[PDB]
Curated annotation (Swiss-Prot):
Top-level EC class as recorded in UniProt: hydrolase
Annotated source species: Homo sapiens
Disulfide-bonded cysteines: C28-C86, C70-C115, C141-C160, C373-C379, C445-C457
Protein name: Alpha-amylase 1A
Modified residues (Pyrrolidone carboxylic acid): Q1
Record-listed Deamidated asparagine modification sites: N345, N407, N454
The EC number(s) this enzyme carries: 3.2.1.1
Site (Transition state stabilizer): D300
Reaction(s) catalysed (UniProt annotation): Endohydrolysis of (1->4)-alpha-D-glucosidic linkages in polysaccharides containing three or more (1->4)-alpha-linked D-glucose units
Gene: AMY1A
Subunit structure: Monomer.
Family membership noted in the UniProt record: Belongs to the glycosyl hydrolase 13 family.
Cofactor note: Binds 1 Ca(2+) ion per subunit. Binds 1 Cl(-) ion per subunit.
Length: 491
């Protein structure tokens, strides 16, 4: 469960949040494959509640109605078509598995669902599964409201309703089996692994019993003995009875401390500065590198404060660049859509808005001639600075963090063995200095500013001498105040 199962030489996953299956399939072929992306985290592919007030919020996909592969992203045929096409070009698919719960207990009964299946939350009836009252934790939960009231009580956090979401009885073999049936459907289609949604709200042991029932990965694409990559969503900033380490037996765990702290540092808030990043990783109190699933932002937290997002493009690129260059963790890059972020004083009242759509029909991703995307899809994963750092990470895979430099403030640099070097200026003055890069002598294309094409560079050239040293000059007024070079950007 700890192996990503990506094709040899690919180290990142991208979240194509709310993208349709046909667009992901195309993206695998035209972009993700040639640009070295390891795989795609897809939005939940199972049937969910169609919520019409507010109008089709992104969060309706976190309220299951059944396990039919039938959503606004597409139907089963489209999902299967995507998985096959992506696997055929060496790009994996990872499914956001929503298995802790079905929908909100107050949602009206009917067929307001993405595949039209009937369901009745009040009577606990989901006949498309099927599940009935006996399959929820109503009787097991001990809180007066039936919902989670206190995170200091690990028991209720697991057995009670998260914000009223009907809580599945994962202690029961029937329920475990129905979830495994769904995940096995996905595995056989060709899925390489799962983001396990709301893992904190499930007993580590119940997750295990579910994973125990899964098939090995599809033997047309994966070697014998291959198991689904597992990364569990657990927000653990400390101070709670439930810890990320409680889930290590099942697979990787999201390290939410990662983006939170990085955001703080790059914004230079709370006294933080980039020079402090010299011991980034376990030195900052993070979980073991071999268990961490890292990211600067995710689909939930890019909607709140502090976290760096595409809205903060300049600092965001820097944060993502640092993440992709640093050996800690397994990296996930975000890809978003733009929504009319309207604030009512520290409150984005439009943080619920779903993907770009025509009367609820998700819009296709259009590609502009300059490689950006239209229809309000942000496509951060296509931004040159990020796309090139995704490749940097592949190029330097396995090389140790070395050659750290800092000016005691916010000008820092470091290398990855003899294969890559990166330099950042987040201070309010110019960074002009000769640094030891650890790289072989030569002329290297800076892949932040440009690209190596046909024996020359479109952007900045860095000259590494025989002793491995090179001069770097980065103005604080630079749009992208960082430079990155690697073995494959050498002329
Ligand atoms: Ca639960
Ligand atoms: Cl996540």
């Amino acid at each position: 469960q700890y192996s990503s199962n990506t094709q040899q030489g690919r180290t990142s996953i991208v979240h194509l949040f709310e993208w349709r299956w046909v667009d992901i399939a195309l993206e695998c072929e035209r972009y993700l494959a040639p640009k070295g992306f390891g795989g795609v985290q897809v939005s939940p592919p199972n049937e969910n509640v169609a919520i019409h007030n507010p109008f089709r919020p992104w969060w309706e996909r976190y309220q299951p109605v059944s396990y039919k592969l039938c959503t606004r992203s597409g139907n089963e045929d489209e999902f299967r078509n995507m998985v096959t096409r992506c696997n055929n070009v060496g790009v994996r698919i990872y499914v956001d598995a929503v298995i802790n719960h079905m929908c909100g207990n107050a949602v009206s009964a009917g067929t307001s669902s993405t595949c039209g299946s009937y369901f009745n939350p009040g009577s606990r009836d989901f006949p498309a599964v099927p599940y009935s009252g006996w399959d929820f934790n109503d009787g097991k939960c001990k809180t007066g409201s039936g919902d989670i009231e206190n995170y200091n009580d690990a028991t209720q956090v697991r057995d009670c309703r998260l914000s009223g979401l009907l809580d599945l009885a994962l202690g029961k073999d029937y329920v475990r089996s129905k979830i495994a049936e769904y995940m096995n459907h996905l595995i056989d289609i060709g899925v390489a692994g799962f983001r396990i949604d709301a893992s904190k709200h499930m007993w580590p042991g119940d997750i295990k019993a579910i994973l125990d029932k899964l098939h090995n990965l599809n033997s047309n694409w994966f070697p014998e003995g291959s198991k689904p990559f597992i990364y569990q969503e657990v927000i653990d900033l400390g101070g709670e009875p439930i810890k990320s380490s409680d889930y290590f037996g099942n697979g990787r765990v999201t390290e939410f401390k990662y983006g939170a702290k990085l955001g703080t540092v790059i914004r230079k808030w709370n006294g933080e500065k980039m020079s402090y990043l010299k011991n980034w990783g376990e030195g900052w109190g993070f979980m073991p590198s071999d268990r961490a699933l890292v990211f600067v932002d995710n689909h939930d937290n890019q909607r709140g404060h502090s976290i760096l997002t595409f809205w903060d493009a300049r600092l965001y690129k820097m944060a993502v660049g640092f993440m992709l260059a640093h050996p800690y963790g397994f990296t996930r890059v975000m890809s978003s859509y733009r929504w009319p972020r309207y604030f009512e004083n520290g409150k984005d009242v439009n943080d619920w808005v779903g993907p770009p759509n025509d009367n609820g029909v998700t819009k296709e991703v259009t590609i502009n001639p300059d490689t950006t995307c239209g229809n309000d899809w942000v496509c951060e994963h296509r931004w040159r600075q990020i796309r090139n750092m995704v490749n940097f990470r592949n190029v330097v895979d396995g090389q140790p963090f070395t050659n750290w430099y800092d000016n005691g403030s916010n000008q820092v640099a470091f290398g990855r063995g003899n294969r890559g070097f990166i330099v950042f200026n987040n201070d309010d003055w110019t960074f002009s200095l000769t640094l030891q890069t650890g790289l072989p002598a030569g002329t290297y294309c800076d892949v932040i500013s440009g690209d190596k094409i046909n024996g020359n560079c479109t952007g900045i050239k860095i000259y590494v001498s025989d002793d491995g040293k090179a001069h770097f000059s980065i103005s604080n007024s630079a749009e992208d105040p960082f430079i990155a070079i690697h073995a494959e950007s050498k002329l």
